[PDB]
Nucleic acid binder design. Structure first.
Ligand SMILES: [Cl-]
Ligand SMILES: [Cl-]
Ligand SMILES: [Cl-]
Ligand SMILES: [Cl-]
Ligand SMILES: [Cl-]
Ligand SMILES: [Mg+2]
Ligand SMILES: [Mg+2]
Ligand SMILES: [Mg+2]
Lengths: 144, 143, 145, 144, 144, 144, 144, 53
RNA sequence: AAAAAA
RNA sequence: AAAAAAAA
RNA sequence: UUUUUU
RNA sequence: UUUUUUUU
RNA sequence: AAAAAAAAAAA
RNA sequence: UUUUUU
RNA sequence: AAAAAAAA
RNA sequence: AAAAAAAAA
RNA sequence: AAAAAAAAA
RNA sequence: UUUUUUUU
RNA sequence: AAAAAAAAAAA
RNA sequence: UUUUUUUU
RNA sequence: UUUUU
RNA sequence: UUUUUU
């Protein structure tokens, strides 16, 4: 309600951290080929395009996908996700298909707490299969 | 009361022949592929909106829709980057379509602490889209 | 706290829009008057860039109020009459208000019933004004459309 | 109660009006022929027989009609009313018939608020049709 | 509500009255000479400027007076009222004075129910006195 | 309920009206050119196609308009409306745009009670603009 | 209750019907001979005088009859109604007599919902008998 | 905007004021200007509720 | 609460 | 209690 | 209680 | 309350 | 027990 | 409440 | 909540 | 009914 | 989303 | 609600 | 809260 | 039992 | 109440 | 309830 500056009765110097962690929802795309699985690299989350180039590690919480280009002729779009982990890759293929040809396909998977460790740029996140030549992704992750 | 009735008016009131006006102004802009276009504040001053008599305006929010179809195989999309005289933003508020035949849409609100006047020479925001036009509806206050 | 930065709006379908909306206003303007002579106030005085209304061509008047704008003749108390005029039939009322102090304005006004609130164009007239003061200040509450 | 004059403590000069408005029901008769409609002119309402000769406009609210003379032999009286408006005449025929030959026939119609604009002497109110030679009208209106 | 005409199921022809009564506040002025009383004539109430030229009798209820022009130099406005009755004039002088030389003087008097009989043009209502050359009155009356 | 005809103890002859009013929603289409407004005629409402050829006037209440044909390539349908009145034309351009190129565009406007007078065939309702060569109208009105 | 037009945010194209049904009370008169029964044809309900010339069928609910002309000398008016149906004519003679020679004779009958089918112009509704040469009818029906 | 106030008594002052919303309450230096004033009287008295800092 | 219909 | 005729 | 409007 | 119906 | 009828001049 | 009456 | 300037 | 601005008016 | 901001009674 | 105080 | 005094013209 | 940036 | 959530 | 007064 004050229109003017005021005096803060500051005390002892507080605990500081010039490089906190930040929880994010990173949107990026990946080019997919027909019948070929594409390994999504973690390194794609580290970029000045997301303000995250200052990080080297990230704990992924959940992954969501969307077909980014139209599907072949006569077909309905589809996208699949196989979760990948350093301690052991999964064989799940969380799939989603569009019920309208003109509409995107989508799917996502959540990572359980016991599997939410850090990952670096060299590591992979999951395999993406699709009949569309491009898939949009949105990863909910904790940079640190 | 089906007939005129007398009014017991009193002293002469405080008057103002040129008041303010809260408005939602719809106008379109042309956008080029892979290029950002600065939305000029001047577009809000026009006889088409009854706002030619104004020279300044306080923008409150900005919403955007793609106005033409997207490139073949692509889904529409539109981004908005707020711009201020005291410092431009780097936010890219993006919305995308989920049906190729449908518009993409997104918008942003200006916080009270940044709601200062802007004149015709100023710019509201940068617009990016894969669509050759974008329809903007800006909720603002003319003064 | 309130927001200190820009925030995203999860807009959706393109809304119904209107670039030339209506506007409810209270317009102030004066009219010169002559002694013992009425003056038909033109509706075209409400349309003007001095009121931001030059873009309108019709208007619905709701009420009319009037104040003498200049002093009265020597030894006289100000006064002002209003006779409503309507295209379907002018009125014969003479709503009159007088001043009780020579140095003070005279005032009066009238309300238009809902059934008589149709559009009026510049060529039309609102009401006649009589007064011993040479100029009268009007404040008209009207809906431009 | 008071039996003598008493001093009123008047103050400022009030808002006055020498020519005020008036709500009225005007009784008058119109002359009607067989099979021929008669347009009731609004000018019939302004007259020193009603104290209304000082008005040039009037807002009609409702119209009531009664036959005024005996019907043709072997017939029961009747009367019709077709509202007329400067913005567009109406085609209704609000009719009323007597159930006794010796009794008047009556009918009427109300004008809705959205159609209650002024009218001048040169205007018409409604068409009257009857098998009686004369008709009696009572028009509720607000002179101004 | 209603946007179109609607029928009225009228019955027998009602009692009517084309020349009814009217309760009014009639504003008018009178010229007054210094030191001389002016008998206000009832005829002033009958006039087409008031819509009452169709009446020939009136019952007065109350009379209020205001000075219409400025007072003499150095003096505060004043005005008196002496009621007059055909049955017997009264010797009251209901006097109101102004407290600002620039402001009107005002006063009035009420007529008791027992002294509320008609009056005709030839009659008078009251004597007015004032140091101002004109007096504006507002008489509340029932024309009949 | 009853399986056979029953007697009605009818009384005096009632009030009747062989030509009553009628509240309707009238659908019709108009041709519109590119960049050119089209004044929609009130006469379109009177017609044997709507059972309203017996009416000569109509009190319009609201207007709703949809695009009837596809829009130009790459564009989304739109339709504007400018209310027109005999007492004064409006400058409002109530617009409605589609968000799916395959979907109609729609918009309407309500007429306020104080503007719900009648209109005749000669009169016009509103100006229609659109990028589609044909517009569908649905006018909620009261025929009288 | 505004004072000026507002925008309606219309939606999809609604279901429409340019030629809806109509519930009506159609008044008309039928000429009758003494001692002879007159069949009332249904086609009399279709006519531009009733705004129904666009209907080819109708469902009749009730019938009411009033003698339209005076009776013979020394007699009291009367009227008889005999319902007629395509699936089988009735033999009821619903009758009503005046208790005052100068007063109409009235009677009507209700059609039960199991016998409320459509009737075309060539069909007949009921036979009429009376000692008056004409008879006024008011039929409550549903035009479709 | 032209917030205007007139007097109903010739011998009386004419008055009018305007409030500045929160989103437009920033600092102003000497060179700057507050508002334009138009009056038929040759002088005008101002009372400005401000916050020096 | 609007119009037509015991 | 619905339907029919009657019925203070 | 029904039908158009809503 | 004369004639008909109404899930046993 | 919020404990009888008014009007005229001065609170 | 003072005070002048039916 | 007392005091100061402001303040519907 | 979580992290990164604050843990006390 | 069911209360408020601007102009008006 | 801008500047001061008020028993820890 | 069954939420202030009447009369004149039109319900 | 204050609220504000970003999170499925 | 018009405009704007 | 509309509306015209003390
Ligand atoms: Cl589709
Ligand atoms: Cl398609
Ligand atoms: Cl003074
Ligand atoms: Cl004129
Ligand atoms: Cl209606
Ligand atoms: Mg797809
Ligand atoms: Mg008769
Ligand atoms: Mg008979």
């Amino acid at each position: 309600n004050s229109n003017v500056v005021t005096m803060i009765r500051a005390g002892s110097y507080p605990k500081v951290n010039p490089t906190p962690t930040w929880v994010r929802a990173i949107p990026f795309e990946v080019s997919v080929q027909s019948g070929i699985a594409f390994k999504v690299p973690v390194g794609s989350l580290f970029s000045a395009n997301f303000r995250t180039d200052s990080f080297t590690s990230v704990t992924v919480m959940s992954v969501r996908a969307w077909t980014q280009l139209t599907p072949p002729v006569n077909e309905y779009s589809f996208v699949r996700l196989k979760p990948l982990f350093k301690t052991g890759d999964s064989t799940e293929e969380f799939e989603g298909r569009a019920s309208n040809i003109n509409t995107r396909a989508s799917v996502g998977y959540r990572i359980p707490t016991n599997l939410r460790q850090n990952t670096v740029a060299a590591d992979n996140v999951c395999e993406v299969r699709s009949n569309c030549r491009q898939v949009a992704l949105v990863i909910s992750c904790c940079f640190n």
